[PDB]
Amino acid sequence: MRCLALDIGGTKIASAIVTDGKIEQRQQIATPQADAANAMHDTLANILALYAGQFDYVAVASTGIINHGVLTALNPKNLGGLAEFPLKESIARHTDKPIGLLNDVQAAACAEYKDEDKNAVQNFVFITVSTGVGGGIILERRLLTEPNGVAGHIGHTLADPNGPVCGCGRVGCVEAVAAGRAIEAVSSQWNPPCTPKQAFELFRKNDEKATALIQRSASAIANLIADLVIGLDVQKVVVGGSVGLAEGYLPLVKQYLNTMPHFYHCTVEQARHGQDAGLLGAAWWVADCLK
């Protein structure tokens, strides 16, 4: 009845107490990256110290392939280099109340979907374009998680066969060319260097060099959406993250989508829950899971 939500990311770790669908007591600490396999027990330790007592169960929403309370990183460059981490057991040191875990954008998808007309929209996909690219797939009003939580990892479906090589090891993933870190990898090597946020500012001023960089990312996502519409009959796609919500972006994605045959069209919308979706969604999904 009283829930501790965590949102482990590449960059920060959000936490809060989620109680009847509202968020209170919201903290966030930077995610440790050097010596992460050890540094993270200590971070979790500190988090369940400040909250202990105020929760009955914990609801984890983190990046990586979340399966059997172990986080396996597909692209570990989104974690300073960290390949896997025993997430469930490390929260077990600080409470023996029950622990539910779930990928960070699968969780966000539950937040974004359980206010939609589940009659008109039964094939739904949330897509985040942030430090990485990921998704959470709802098919027949259900979250796709079986058997090993791998379901939804559409940032590592192919975007270009001649594309850059991904952190995951495969050539050409959507993530390798569309994510915040793919943009930053090209823009931080400009003279002078640019953060992705500054690249967008030049994009909004019609700089061709910056526009090319942003178009490289929007087109890939447009294609990924088309792939989801044609391959799964996805009716709606909601797009979030620090790059999806960038001003001018979803308009640009949608432009590419409309040059495609109408077979590839569907509703494409911005996310209503921002950076709280991970915590909210992760709570509801651990609620639903204990009946």
In the complex, the residues that contact a copy of itself under the rule CB under 8 A are 65, 74, 122-123, 137, 139-140, 144, 146-154, 156-162, 168-170, 219, 223, 226-227, 229-233, 235, 260-261, 263-264
Helix (H) or strand (E) holding 133: strand 133-139
- 40 in helix, strand or coil? helix
In angstroms, rounded to a whole number, what is the distance separating the alpha carbons of residues 124 and 60?
22
Q: Does 173 bind Zn ion (CB under 5 A)?
A: yes
Between 45 and 84, how does the x/- string for binding to ligand BM3 read (CB under 6 A)? ------------------xx--------xxx--xx-----
The bridge status of strand 3-8 relative to strand 12-19 is antiparallel
Interface residues for ligand BM3 in 211-240 (CB under 6 A)? none
Does 166 help bind Zn ion (rule: CB under 5 A)? yes
Task: Report the partner that residue 64 touches, choosing among ligand BM3, Zn ion, a copy of itself, none (CB closer than 5 to 8 A by kind).
Answer: ligand BM3
Cα–Cα distance for residue pair 114/119, rounded to 1 Å: 11
Do strands 12-19 and 70-72 pair parallel, antiparallel, or not at all (unpaired)? unpaired
Q: Please check whether residue 204 is in contact with residue 213, taking contact to mean a CB–CB distance below 8 angstroms.
A: no
Q: Which is nearer to a copy of itself, 181 or 236 (CB)?
A: 236
Q: Give the one entry of ligand BM3, Zn ion, a copy of itself, none that residue 161 binds, where binding means its C-beta sits below a cut-off of 5 to 8 angstroms depending on kind.
A: a copy of itself
Which of the stretches 171-179, 186-194, 202-210, 257-265 binds Zn ion when contact is defined by CB under 5 A?
A: 171-179
Look up residue 85 and give its two tokens: 């981490």
Measured CA to CA in angstroms, residue 48 lies from 11, 51, 231 at distances of 19, 5, 42
List contacts with ligand BM3 (CB under 6 A): 63-64, 73-75, 78-79, 103-105, 128, 130-134, 153, 155, 175
